[PDB]
Amino acid sequence: RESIELPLMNPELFIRVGIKPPKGVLLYGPPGTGKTLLARAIASNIDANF
Amino acid sequence: TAKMNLSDEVDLEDYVSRPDKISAAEITAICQEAGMHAVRKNRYVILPKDFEKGYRSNVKKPDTDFDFYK
Amino acid sequence: MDNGGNLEAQIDALLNVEKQMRLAGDVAGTRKAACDILDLCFQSKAWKTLNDQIVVLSKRRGQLKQAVTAMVQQAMGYIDQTPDLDIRVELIKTLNSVSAGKIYVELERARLIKILAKIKEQQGLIDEAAELMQEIAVETFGAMAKTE
């Protein structure tokens, strides 16, 4: 959430911090970990903006 | 680190002197990662400890160099 | 001359409860415990111990943001009711030191420093007030209201 949706929430916060918001985060997980489910759920923040 | 706060005690060379074979973006990566950690911690300045969470977080290499070779 | 022991014992008990809640991750419990500690310190008009406790709680490893926010807001609320100008300055300095480098307390820090600058101006120390209040870059406080 802080990786993707926190940036769209108030990137001015990160700017005041002094660093740019996260560019892109890749998910590391042993095979059969079910990371894909994480993204399928993250699709529950816009449902049209994904 | 110019646009960082680094309030009072974060020694800049303190982590530079480490061997920590790094990359030109690796320094920027450590800086941003400390920034993100502080954002999660809401520290309007970069605490000298967050430098620790950054330097080791970004230089996460499993070298596993045996000291036997010395 | 017997209240000091009761005050310290109660502060220690509240600190233990605060540690329990903070390790438990309960924002409401930790915030309420800190507010209770501040109330105990204030009601006893033990300003020095109040400042010491504020600093101690602010410097603890892993304190929650909202508890500190409530503590600082209540401490600013205590500034007006204090009787001594010297105590005003000391309390203001302690809050300013605690809030330095904390994003979610920059509003309180800015108001606090403005009040201190006003106090210094009342003393005729215009140079000191100007130099001190110059130290804030309110431009970067996005959470701040444009008018103020």
GROMACS .gro file of C-alpha atoms in nm:
model
  268
    1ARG     CA    1   0.000   0.000   0.000
    2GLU     CA    2   0.276   0.245   0.093
    3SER     CA    3   0.452   0.118  -0.221
    4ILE     CA    4   0.182   0.213  -0.475
    5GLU     CA    5  -0.129   0.374  -0.324
    6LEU     CA    6   0.056   0.587  -0.069
    7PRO     CA    7   0.225   0.769  -0.361
    8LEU     CA    8  -0.107   0.859  -0.524
    9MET     CA    9  -0.245   0.955  -0.181
   10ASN     CA   10  -0.014   1.252  -0.107
   11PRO     CA   11   0.311   1.249  -0.307
   12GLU     CA   12   0.368   1.594  -0.158
   13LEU     CA   13   0.446   1.405   0.162
   14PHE     CA   14   0.735   1.223  -0.005
   15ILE     CA   15   0.847   1.548  -0.169
   16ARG     CA   16   0.861   1.720   0.171
   17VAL     CA   17   1.061   1.415   0.280
   18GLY     CA   18   1.311   1.498   0.007
   19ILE     CA   19   1.293   1.191  -0.217
   20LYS     CA   20   1.081   1.111  -0.518
   21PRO     CA   21   0.791   0.866  -0.474
   22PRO     CA   22   0.856   0.499  -0.551
   23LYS     CA   23   0.910   0.434  -0.920
   24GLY     CA   24   0.831   0.064  -0.952
   25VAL     CA   25   0.830  -0.227  -0.710
   26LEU     CA   26   0.881  -0.590  -0.809
   27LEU     CA   27   0.747  -0.875  -0.595
   28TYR     CA   28   0.989  -1.150  -0.492
   29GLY     CA   29   0.846  -1.481  -0.381
   30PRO     CA   30   0.930  -1.851  -0.401
   31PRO     CA   31   0.730  -2.044  -0.661
   32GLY     CA   32   0.371  -2.111  -0.560
   33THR     CA   33   0.380  -1.821  -0.314
   34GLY     CA   34   0.063  -1.667  -0.461
   35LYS     CA   35   0.196  -1.315  -0.516
   36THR     CA   36  -0.044  -1.286  -0.811
   37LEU     CA   37  -0.324  -1.283  -0.553
   38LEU     CA   38  -0.163  -0.973  -0.402
   39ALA     CA   39  -0.200  -0.789  -0.734
   40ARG     CA   40  -0.551  -0.925  -0.789
   41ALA     CA   41  -0.647  -0.772  -0.453
   42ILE     CA   42  -0.459  -0.447  -0.521
   43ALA     CA   43  -0.695  -0.426  -0.818
   44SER     CA   44  -0.949  -0.339  -0.545
   45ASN     CA   45  -0.827   0.023  -0.522
   46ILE     CA   46  -0.944   0.158  -0.860
   47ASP     CA   47  -1.090  -0.138  -1.056
   48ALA     CA   48  -1.067   0.084  -1.365
   49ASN     CA   49  -0.729   0.250  -1.306
   50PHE     CA   50  -0.529  -0.075  -1.298
   51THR     CA   51   2.190   1.371   0.039
   52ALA     CA   52   2.176   1.745  -0.036
   53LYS     CA   53   1.794   1.765  -0.035
   54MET     CA   54   1.774   1.547   0.277
   55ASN     CA   55   1.729   1.673   0.634
   56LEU     CA   56   1.976   1.453   0.829
   57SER     CA   57   1.885   1.647   1.139
   58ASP     CA   58   2.187   1.650   1.370
   59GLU     CA   59   2.391   1.331   1.396
   60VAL     CA   60   2.385   1.123   1.077
   61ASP     CA   61   2.754   1.100   0.988
   62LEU     CA   62   2.780   1.100   0.609
   63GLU     CA   63   3.124   0.937   0.584
   64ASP     CA   64   3.019   0.700   0.863
   65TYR     CA   65   2.863   0.466   0.605
   66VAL     CA   66   3.078   0.579   0.311
   67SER     CA   67   3.396   0.436   0.466
   68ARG     CA   68   3.242   0.087   0.459
   69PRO     CA   69   3.379  -0.121   0.170
   70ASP     CA   70   3.024  -0.179   0.047
   71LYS     CA   71   3.104  -0.211  -0.322
   72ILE     CA   72   2.812  -0.013  -0.467
   73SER     CA   73   2.674   0.142  -0.786
   74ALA     CA   74   2.609   0.504  -0.883
   75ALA     CA   75   2.235   0.440  -0.858
   76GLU     CA   76   2.303   0.230  -0.547
   77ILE     CA   77   2.382   0.546  -0.350
   78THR     CA   78   2.060   0.702  -0.482
   79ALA     CA   79   1.877   0.380  -0.399
   80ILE     CA   80   2.005   0.384  -0.039
   81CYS     CA   81   1.908   0.751  -0.009
   82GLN     CA   82   1.554   0.693  -0.136
   83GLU     CA   83   1.512   0.380   0.078
   84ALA     CA   84   1.610   0.573   0.390
   85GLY     CA   85   1.366   0.841   0.276
   86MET     CA   86   1.088   0.584   0.239
   87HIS     CA   87   1.167   0.433   0.580
   88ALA     CA   88   1.149   0.779   0.739
   89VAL     CA   89   0.822   0.843   0.555
   90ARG     CA   90   0.683   0.528   0.715
   91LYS     CA   91   0.831   0.667   1.039
   92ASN     CA   92   0.722   1.026   0.961
   93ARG     CA   93   1.060   1.175   1.057
   94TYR     CA   94   1.077   1.521   0.901
   95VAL     CA   95   1.455   1.474   0.914
   96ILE     CA   96   1.662   1.167   0.829
   97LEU     CA   97   1.749   1.012   1.164
   98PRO     CA   98   2.108   0.884   1.188
   99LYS     CA   99   1.969   0.534   1.250
  100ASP     CA  100   1.766   0.522   0.927
  101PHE     CA  101   2.100   0.543   0.746
  102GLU     CA  102   2.169   0.202   0.900
  103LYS     CA  103   1.838   0.055   0.781
  104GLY     CA  104   1.923   0.189   0.436
  105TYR     CA  105   2.288   0.096   0.384
  106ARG     CA  106   2.234  -0.268   0.482
  107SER     CA  107   1.894  -0.290   0.308
  108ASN     CA  108   2.029  -0.177  -0.029
  109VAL     CA  109   2.363  -0.366  -0.010
  110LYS     CA  110   2.168  -0.693   0.052
  111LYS     CA  111   2.414  -0.919  -0.140
  112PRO     CA  112   2.454  -1.289  -0.039
  113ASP     CA  113   2.836  -1.289  -0.097
  114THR     CA  114   2.887  -1.548   0.185
  115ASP     CA  115   3.268  -1.501   0.151
  116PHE     CA  116   3.446  -1.777   0.352
  117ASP     CA  117   3.708  -1.626   0.591
  118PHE     CA  118   3.912  -1.949   0.533
  119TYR     CA  119   4.060  -1.796   0.213
  120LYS     CA  120   4.142  -1.478   0.417
  121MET     CA  121   0.600   1.729   5.104
  122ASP     CA  122   0.487   1.373   5.029
  123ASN     CA  123   0.331   1.398   4.681
  124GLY     CA  124   0.656   1.343   4.491
  125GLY     CA  125   0.667   0.971   4.565
  126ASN     CA  126   0.306   0.923   4.456
  127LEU     CA  127   0.372   1.122   4.138
  128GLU     CA  128   0.678   0.918   4.042
  129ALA     CA  129   0.507   0.587   4.121
  130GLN     CA  130   0.199   0.680   3.916
  131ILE     CA  131   0.419   0.797   3.628
  132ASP     CA  132   0.608   0.466   3.637
  133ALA     CA  133   0.283   0.266   3.635
  134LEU     CA  134   0.147   0.468   3.343
  135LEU     CA  135   0.478   0.422   3.161
  136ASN     CA  136   0.453   0.045   3.208
  137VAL     CA  137   0.099   0.048   3.068
  138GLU     CA  138   0.221   0.269   2.782
  139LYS     CA  139   0.500   0.024   2.700
  140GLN     CA  140   0.251  -0.264   2.705
  141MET     CA  141   0.012  -0.086   2.468
  142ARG     CA  142   0.291   0.037   2.239
  143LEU     CA  143   0.431  -0.314   2.205
  144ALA     CA  144   0.070  -0.423   2.141
  145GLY     CA  145   0.041  -0.163   1.864
  146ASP     CA  146  -0.277  -0.006   2.003
  147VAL     CA  147  -0.281   0.359   1.894
  148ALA     CA  148  -0.576   0.454   2.116
  149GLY     CA  149  -0.437   0.289   2.429
  150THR     CA  150  -0.090   0.441   2.394
  151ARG     CA  151  -0.234   0.785   2.316
  152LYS     CA  152  -0.466   0.771   2.618
  153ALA     CA  153  -0.184   0.655   2.846
  154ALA     CA  154   0.039   0.940   2.730
  155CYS     CA  155  -0.245   1.189   2.780
  156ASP     CA  156  -0.297   1.051   3.131
  157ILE     CA  157   0.073   1.095   3.209
  158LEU     CA  158   0.062   1.453   3.083
  159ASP     CA  159  -0.251   1.523   3.290
  160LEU     CA  160  -0.084   1.383   3.602
  161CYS     CA  161   0.227   1.594   3.544
  162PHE     CA  162   0.026   1.911   3.477
  163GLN     CA  163  -0.214   1.880   3.771
  164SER     CA  164   0.091   1.856   3.999
  165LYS     CA  165   0.238   2.173   3.840
  166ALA     CA  166   0.568   1.981   3.823
  167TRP     CA  167   0.683   2.148   3.503
  168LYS     CA  168   1.039   2.012   3.511
  169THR     CA  169   0.917   1.653   3.542
  170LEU     CA  170   0.658   1.723   3.271
  171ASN     CA  171   0.934   1.831   3.032
  172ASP     CA  172   1.155   1.536   3.128
  173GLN     CA  173   0.871   1.291   3.066
  174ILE     CA  174   0.786   1.457   2.734
  175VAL     CA  175   1.146   1.421   2.617
  176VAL     CA  176   1.171   1.062   2.742
  177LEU     CA  177   0.854   0.951   2.562
  178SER     CA  178   0.955   1.140   2.248
  179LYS     CA  179   1.294   0.965   2.239
  180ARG     CA  180   1.164   0.609   2.287
  181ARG     CA  181   1.242   0.344   2.024
  182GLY     CA  182   0.935   0.287   1.809
  183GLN     CA  183   0.685   0.542   1.939
  184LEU     CA  184   0.362   0.578   1.742
  185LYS     CA  185   0.298   0.900   1.550
  186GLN     CA  186  -0.053   0.967   1.679
  187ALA     CA  187   0.035   0.933   2.048
  188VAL     CA  188   0.313   1.190   2.006
  189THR     CA  189   0.077   1.414   1.810
  190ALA     CA  190  -0.176   1.408   2.094
  191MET     CA  191   0.097   1.466   2.352
  192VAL     CA  192   0.230   1.770   2.166
  193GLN     CA  193  -0.116   1.915   2.104
  194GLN     CA  194  -0.204   1.882   2.473
  195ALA     CA  195   0.132   2.029   2.574
  196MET     CA  196   0.063   2.331   2.354
  197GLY     CA  197  -0.277   2.347   2.521
  198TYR     CA  198  -0.095   2.368   2.854
  199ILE     CA  199   0.118   2.667   2.750
  200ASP     CA  200  -0.145   2.934   2.819
  201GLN     CA  201  -0.235   2.817   3.172
  202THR     CA  202   0.122   2.816   3.305
  203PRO     CA  203   0.205   3.096   3.554
  204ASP     CA  204   0.575   3.165   3.488
  205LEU     CA  205   0.730   3.321   3.179
  206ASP     CA  206   1.054   3.133   3.245
  207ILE     CA  207   0.853   2.811   3.260
  208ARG     CA  208   0.684   2.920   2.937
  209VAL     CA  209   1.022   2.954   2.765
  210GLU     CA  210   1.154   2.625   2.903
  211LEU     CA  211   0.841   2.431   2.805
  212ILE     CA  212   0.843   2.591   2.460
  213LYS     CA  213   1.208   2.496   2.411
  214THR     CA  214   1.139   2.138   2.518
  215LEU     CA  215   0.843   2.100   2.279
  216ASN     CA  216   1.043   2.257   1.996
  217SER     CA  217   1.335   2.020   2.055
  218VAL     CA  218   1.100   1.721   2.067
  219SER     CA  219   0.907   1.819   1.753
  220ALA     CA  220   1.215   1.897   1.541
  221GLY     CA  221   1.238   1.663   1.244
  222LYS     CA  222   0.884   1.523   1.286
  223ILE     CA  223   0.655   1.576   0.986
  224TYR     CA  224   0.329   1.521   1.177
  225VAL     CA  225   0.423   1.788   1.436
  226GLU     CA  226   0.554   2.066   1.210
  227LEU     CA  227   0.227   2.258   1.251
  228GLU     CA  228   0.265   2.252   1.629
  229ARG     CA  229   0.632   2.345   1.599
  230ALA     CA  230   0.552   2.644   1.375
  231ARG     CA  231   0.280   2.774   1.606
  232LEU     CA  232   0.509   2.719   1.905
  233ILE     CA  233   0.799   2.910   1.749
  234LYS     CA  234   0.568   3.194   1.647
  235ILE     CA  235   0.449   3.219   2.008
  236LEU     CA  236   0.810   3.219   2.131
  237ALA     CA  237   0.899   3.493   1.882
  238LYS     CA  238   0.606   3.698   2.012
  239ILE     CA  239   0.729   3.646   2.369
  240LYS     CA  240   1.083   3.751   2.275
  241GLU     CA  241   0.946   4.060   2.100
  242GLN     CA  242   0.758   4.147   2.419
  243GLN     CA  243   1.098   4.139   2.593
  244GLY     CA  244   1.250   4.374   2.334
  245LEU     CA  245   1.479   4.102   2.193
  246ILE     CA  246   1.373   4.167   1.835
  247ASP     CA  247   1.695   4.024   1.690
  248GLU     CA  248   1.662   3.699   1.884
  249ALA     CA  249   1.297   3.654   1.784
  250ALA     CA  250   1.373   3.720   1.417
  251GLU     CA  251   1.674   3.486   1.408
  252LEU     CA  252   1.489   3.209   1.591
  253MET     CA  253   1.168   3.222   1.388
  254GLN     CA  254   1.367   3.244   1.064
  255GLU     CA  255   1.479   2.884   1.119
  256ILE     CA  256   1.149   2.740   0.987
  257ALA     CA  257   1.088   2.679   0.616
  258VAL     CA  258   0.709   2.698   0.627
  259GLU     CA  259   0.711   2.694   0.245
  260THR     CA  260   0.761   2.316   0.255
  261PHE     CA  261   0.475   2.253   0.503
  262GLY     CA  262   0.216   2.130   0.256
  263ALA     CA  263  -0.022   2.039   0.539
  264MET     CA  264  -0.023   2.405   0.648
  265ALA     CA  265  -0.301   2.645   0.549
  266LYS     CA  266  -0.208   2.907   0.290
  267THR     CA  267  -0.347   3.202   0.486
  268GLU     CA  268  -0.139   3.133   0.796
   0.00000   0.00000   0.00000
